[PDB]
Enzyme design. Structure first.
Site, PDB file in Angstrom:
ATOM      1  CG  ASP A  93      -2.150   0.908   0.980  1.00 28.31           C
ATOM      2  OD1 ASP A  93      -2.258   1.547  -0.095  1.00 28.31           O
ATOM      3  OD2 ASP A  93      -2.974   1.004   1.910  1.00 28.31           O
ATOM      4  CG  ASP A 267      -5.474  -5.459   2.146  1.00 34.47           C
ATOM      5  OD1 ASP A 267      -6.027  -4.834   1.220  1.00 34.47           O
ATOM      6  OD2 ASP A 267      -5.272  -4.962   3.273  1.00 34.47           O
ATOM      7  CB  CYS A 305      -9.718 -26.233   9.313  1.00 34.54           C
ATOM      8  SG  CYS A 305      -8.217 -25.312   8.980  1.00 34.54           S
ATOM      9  CB  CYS A 307      -4.623 -25.253   9.003  1.00 41.62           C
ATOM     10  SG  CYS A 307      -4.980 -25.019  10.758  1.00 41.62           S
ATOM     11  CB  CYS A 310      -7.458 -27.960  12.362  1.00 41.85           C
ATOM     12  SG  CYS A 310      -8.113 -26.317  12.733  1.00 41.85           S
ATOM     13  CG  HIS A 336      -7.576 -22.040  12.400  1.00 40.03           C
ATOM     14  ND1 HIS A 336      -8.062 -23.133  11.708  1.00 40.03           N
ATOM     15  CD2 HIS A 336      -8.624 -21.202  12.577  1.00 40.03           C
ATOM     16  CE1 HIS A 336      -9.361 -22.975  11.518  1.00 40.03           C
ATOM     17  NE2 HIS A 336      -9.725 -21.813  12.033  1.00 40.03           N
TER      18      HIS A 336
HETATM   19  N1  LIG Z   1      -4.208   3.445  -0.384  1.00 43.97           N
HETATM   20  C1  LIG Z   1      -5.391   3.104   0.141  1.00 43.97           C
HETATM   21  N2  LIG Z   1      -5.425   2.151   1.099  1.00 43.97           N
HETATM   22  C2  LIG Z   1      -6.597   1.793   1.687  1.00 43.97           C
HETATM   23  C3  LIG Z   1      -6.618   0.850   2.708  1.00 43.97           C
HETATM   24  C4  LIG Z   1      -7.841   0.526   3.295  1.00 43.97           C
HETATM   25  N3  LIG Z   1      -8.144  -0.310   4.324  1.00 43.97           N
HETATM   26  C5  LIG Z   1      -9.476  -0.213   4.456  1.00 43.97           C
HETATM   27  N4  LIG Z   1     -10.203  -0.895   5.369  1.00 43.97           N
HETATM   28  C6  LIG Z   1      -9.607  -1.550   6.532  1.00 43.97           C
HETATM   29  C7  LIG Z   1     -10.640  -1.650   7.646  1.00 43.97           C
HETATM   30  C8  LIG Z   1     -10.294  -2.595   8.776  1.00 43.97           C
HETATM   31  C9  LIG Z   1      -9.752  -2.104   9.957  1.00 43.97           C
HETATM   32  C10 LIG Z   1      -9.460  -2.974  11.001  1.00 43.97           C
HETATM   33  C11 LIG Z   1      -9.715  -4.333  10.861  1.00 43.97           C
HETATM   34  C12 LIG Z   1      -9.423  -5.280  11.982  1.00 43.97           C
HETATM   35  O1  LIG Z   1      -8.616  -4.940  12.867  1.00 43.97           O
HETATM   36  O2  LIG Z   1     -10.023  -6.374  12.004  1.00 43.97           O
HETATM   37  C13 LIG Z   1     -10.272  -4.819   9.686  1.00 43.97           C
HETATM   38  C14 LIG Z   1     -10.564  -3.950   8.644  1.00 43.97           C
HETATM   39  N5  LIG Z   1     -10.053   0.643   3.613  1.00 43.97           N
HETATM   40  C15 LIG Z   1      -9.031   1.137   2.865  1.00 43.97           C
HETATM   41  C16 LIG Z   1      -9.006   2.071   1.839  1.00 43.97           C
HETATM   42  C17 LIG Z   1      -7.784   2.406   1.273  1.00 43.97           C
HETATM   43  C18 LIG Z   1      -7.715   3.429   0.203  1.00 43.97           C
HETATM   44  O3  LIG Z   1      -8.726   4.027  -0.236  1.00 43.97           O
HETATM   45  N6  LIG Z   1      -6.502   3.734  -0.275  1.00 43.97           N
HETATM   46 ZN   LIG Z   2      -7.267 -24.964  11.071  1.00 47.58          ZN
END
Ligand SMILES: Nc1nc2cc3nc(NCCc4ccc(C(=O)O)cc4)[nH]c3cc2c(=O)[nH]1
Ligand SMILES: [Zn+2]
Ligand SMILES: Nc1nc2cc3nc(NCCc4ccc(C(=O)O)cc4)[nH]c3cc2c(=O)[nH]1
Ligand SMILES: [Zn+2]
Lengths: 370, 370
Positions: A93, A267, A305, A307, A310, A336
């Protein structure tokens, strides 16, 4: 020898696609899930373990790595791949999101200056340079992830800036011969939840031309219904013949629905972070292994699973480890969860290939949310 | 099929011995180092990784396991071996030391009652029972580790109680047929730093009769010179034909000198704990990987070490991980340190076998302390 970049679609079902991205460092099967390795490690896993779960590619972060250990330092040490011991593709990113998420910032048309969570700077040119120094295989354009909610005016202004930055990112990448010849560059669509802005953004990105197209600006608090609504109109705007990457998504059901809407790449920190917190994914939905109900449960985390976790350890043991704050608990939960995510992606790929993805999605949901 | 217990000495050099202990669950090469797995895990390592480093046996703790997750619970789940996924021998300390080290205690001739760091009880009978419930292969007598320094009167009174407890431990173990037939029982010599008390303790233990004999009451703040002085007279007091186990020792040079004095078995948290803290063992002495001097050092932790960590990752990477508080840093440091300890033991065994252990000890020290 593999090309710099080639995306081939082997099968389709509705908007869903399955195929492969070939790159110099490896083949990526799509739809793909990328484990997140923000600080040059997928937390609590050796790279060999990440690979064993089925991952073809991992994600790194320009923002975190530029702060620690430093981009120039990593370049001096031979690049991110050598540094961390992962020899397959890495997507990075661009910083566009993490700087605004984590820092404490001055934004302008030039870029963003910020305080490390010391003063630092990002811009399209510097972001692309950092990703070069890291030796990223898939380089993300430097963008602005518009906050949610956003008014149409602010979303438009933000998106327009991101498109100017996308062109600067393209030019920076192309001006660096070694990078242009060995890596790929993806553009990032913005426009918040607004169809007309999403269209303008897609048009701008396609005019510039990228190897792949991310849907940015989502998973920012809008919730699944709204995210899916935006994907419904946004993904068809992107070039069909290039990968579609939904950034930061997501829960298993988010992934399934996003694939139904034409997304090829994902991701999310969810499987790693929540694994360390005691949440295990199963085909019958997530469980929290800390719960007392698991204290004497000899079953594996998930009954199907495949893995290594498991195959060998019980819920009861992992319950104990997580309760005790033991590192092995983090290790086992994480392996896992990442394996579960990869098995989900494999089931998605197989079902699309076999023309039964709609049925898979329905069966998956019926059981996961029973 | 292997016997319950058989110790055979293959070679000697001065007081040093090398040989094997055969037990039902495996062979233990001596001199042996036992990684410590206090809470049913060798911290930050899968059991397969512990085995890969060369460990033949690990140590567990009656005290910690009785508190969490509970001895009866582990028995219900199939025993410690199944629970944690280590199928080779496990030695369990008896609680005699950890209760007084960690709890917040009422001591009597019956045993010790204590508050969990809830009220709990240990005694020779309960300690042996817990070790049975865990399915320990080498069971330690329940003893009292005399504080250091101790007056001769207090050391004598303490040692005498420990010897009464050693007989109770013997009888408890023998009364449990399955335990007596499948596990071994080691007695623990006490007597502080006093030759006459050490002799009385050895005599008492030999009269009762055990499968092995630990030197207890050391590594309690006395320092190496004093520890070695006590070992000089104490180890020859123990039966020659049984293993000699020095509890809680130690640094690499402690181990070498203790082997020179007739010790066959060791355990210590040093390689695991200090690994997580950033200390890596090398043949040129320990290093602290956190130090800025390692930030761009591409060399492995140790130049000769055969471990998987040294085959793959640089000091620079591990420096970054430990600085960042990353779990993989703990994992890699720990695997290397335990591997280093096992390589030390292998060099010790080979040199004794070849009649060049004196030269090895001298060469080791010259380089380690250069
Ligand atoms: N360059 C760029 N990078 C991004 C990364 C991002 N990541 C997200 N969402 C992540 C949300 C998120 C936050 C925390 C957890 C967890 O801890 O479980 C899971 C998901 N939206 C996103 C939007 C963008 C974007 O427009 N531009
Ligand atoms: Zn597993
Ligand atoms: N039953 C019994 N158990 C013992 C365990 C011991 N452990 C030690 N020494 C450990 C010292 C120790 C403490 C911390 C670290 C580190 O963190 O590096 C290393 C060594 N002395 C010990 C003596 C006894 C004993 O008489 N009876
Ligand atoms: Zn090593």
């Amino acid at each position: 020898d593999r090309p710099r970049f080639s995306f081939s679609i082997a099968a389709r079902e509705g908007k869903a696609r399955t195929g492969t991205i070939e790159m110099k460092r490896g083949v990526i099967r799509t739809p793909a899930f990328m484990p997140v390795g923000t600080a040059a490690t997928v937390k609590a896993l050796k790279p060999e373990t990440v690979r064993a779960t089925g991952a073809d590619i991992i994600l790194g972060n320009t923002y975190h790595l530029m702060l620690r250990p430093g981009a120039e330092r990593i370049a001096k040490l031979g690049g991110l791949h050598s540094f961390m011991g992962w020899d397959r593709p890495i997507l990075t990113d661009s910083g566009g999101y993490q700087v605004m998420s984590l820092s404490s910032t001055k934004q302008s048309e030039e870029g963003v200056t910020f305080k490390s969570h010391s003063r630092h700077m990002l811009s399209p040119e510097r972001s692309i340079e950092i990703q070069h120094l890291l030796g990223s295989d898939i380089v993300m354009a430097f963008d602005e992830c518009t906050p949610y909610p956003a008014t149409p005016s602010r979303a438009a202004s933000s998106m327009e800036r991101s498109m100017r930055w996308a062109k600067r990112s393209r030019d920076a990448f192309d001006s660096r011969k070694e990078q242009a010849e060995n890596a790929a560059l993806f553009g990032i669509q913005q426009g918040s939840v607004f169809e007309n802005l999403r269209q303008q953004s897609a048009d701008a990105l396609a005019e510039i031309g990228f190897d792949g197209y991310a849907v940015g600006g989502l998973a920012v608090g809008e919730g699944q219904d709204e995210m899916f609504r935006v994907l419904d109109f946004s993904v068809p705007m992107l070039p069909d013949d290039k990968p579609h990457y939904l950034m930061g998504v997501g829960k298993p059901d988010d992934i399934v629905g996003a694939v139904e809407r034409g997304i090829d790449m994902f991701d999310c920190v969810l499987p790693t972070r929540s694994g360390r917190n005691g949440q295990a994914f199963t085909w019958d939905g997530p469980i929290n292994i800390r719960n007392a109900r698991f204290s004497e449960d000899l079953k594996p985390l998930d009954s199907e699973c495949h893995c290594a976790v498991c195959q060998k350890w019980s819920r009861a043991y992992i319950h104990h480890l997580i309760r005790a704050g033991e590192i092995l608990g983090a290790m086992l939960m994480t392996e896992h969860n990442i394996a579960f995510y990869q098995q989900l992606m494999q089931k998605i790929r197989d079902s699309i290939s076999e023309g039964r993805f709609s049925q898979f999605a329905q069966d998956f949901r019926a059981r996961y949310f029973a």
